[PDB]
Design a protein around this ligand. Structure first.
Ligand SMILES: *C(=O)c1ccc(NC(=N)N)cc1
Length: 245
């Protein structure tokens, strides 16, 4: 997260760290006792399931905490529609090897219905332990970073991404995607933040509106963060989790 600030411990109790061979690679969101939502691109097919971990209830990643819990995975389920970087269906269900117990630091985030609308300009928050500027790691002890970002429609976002665009690149915001951020630079999600939550406030609660997907160099002007809409996968998630509950 660039241009953000340190969250307080336990402020975003659904935020998880996802590691591969012990190294933080992506964020994710706890959605029940045994399921985490993240981005499909965080889990390439050649990676071994047994090499992944999920760390829950953490604030400072490098610090020891009696409140943090670490789990391995029983299953990794990317949406079948996911193909390459930038494509639709950039969402994955992760089943923990065993269910965990909720605590003051470990709590699930409510999922939006298929027809939940979050209005343009709604001030949501994106969180993560990703880079704090292009190619600059968050410094040890790595406290969780947070950033308020207003929602930006895919249509405006596509227009923004078309400004000074690299010809050879797709930067197409798909029908299952939304953006959030600022036309000017400075404040955005970065590498290491992907797969994590865009939490939006509705009727006294917080919903998982978006899963950090992709973007240009983080914090560049005309390049706000791109998110997969959880609403686009409401039915699929409910089906998968119920069959495998
Ligand atoms: C994920 O690691 C990720 C998401 C988004 C960006 N770029 C922008 N937010 N512009 C980089 C990396």
């Amino acid at each position: 997260i660039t241009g953000g600030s340190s969250a307080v411990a336990g402020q975003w109790p659904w935020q998880v760290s996802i590691t591969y061979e012990g190294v933080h690679v992506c964020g994710g969101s706890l959605v029940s006792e045994q399921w985490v939502l993240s981005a499909a691109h965080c889990f390439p097919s050649e990676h071994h399931k047994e090499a992944y971990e999920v760390k829950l209830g953490a604030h400072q990643l490098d610090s020891y905490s009696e409140d943090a819990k670490v789990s391995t995975l029983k299953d990794i389920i990317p949406h079948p529609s996911y193909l390459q970087e930038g494509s639709q269906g950039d969402i994955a269900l992760l089943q923990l090897s065993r269910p965990i117990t909720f605590s003051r630091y470990i709590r699930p985030i409510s999922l939006p219905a298929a027809n939940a609308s979050f209005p343009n300009g709604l001030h949501c928050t994106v969180t993560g332990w990703g880079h704090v500027a292009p190619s600059v790691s968050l410094l040890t002890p790595k406290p969780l970073q947070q950033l308020e970002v207003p929602l930006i429609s895919r249509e405006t976002c596509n227009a923004l991404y078309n400004i000074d665009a690299k010809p050879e690149e797709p930067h197409f915001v798909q029908e299952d995607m939304v953006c959030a951020g600022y036309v000017e630079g400075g404040k955005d999600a970065c590498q290491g933040d992907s797969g994590g939550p865009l939490s939006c406030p509705v009727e006294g609660l917080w919903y998982l509106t978006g899963i950090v997907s992709w973007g240009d160099a983080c914090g560049a002007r005309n390049r706000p963060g791109v998110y997969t809409l959880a609403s686009s996968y409401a039915s699929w998630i409910q089906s998968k989790v119920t069959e495998l509950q």
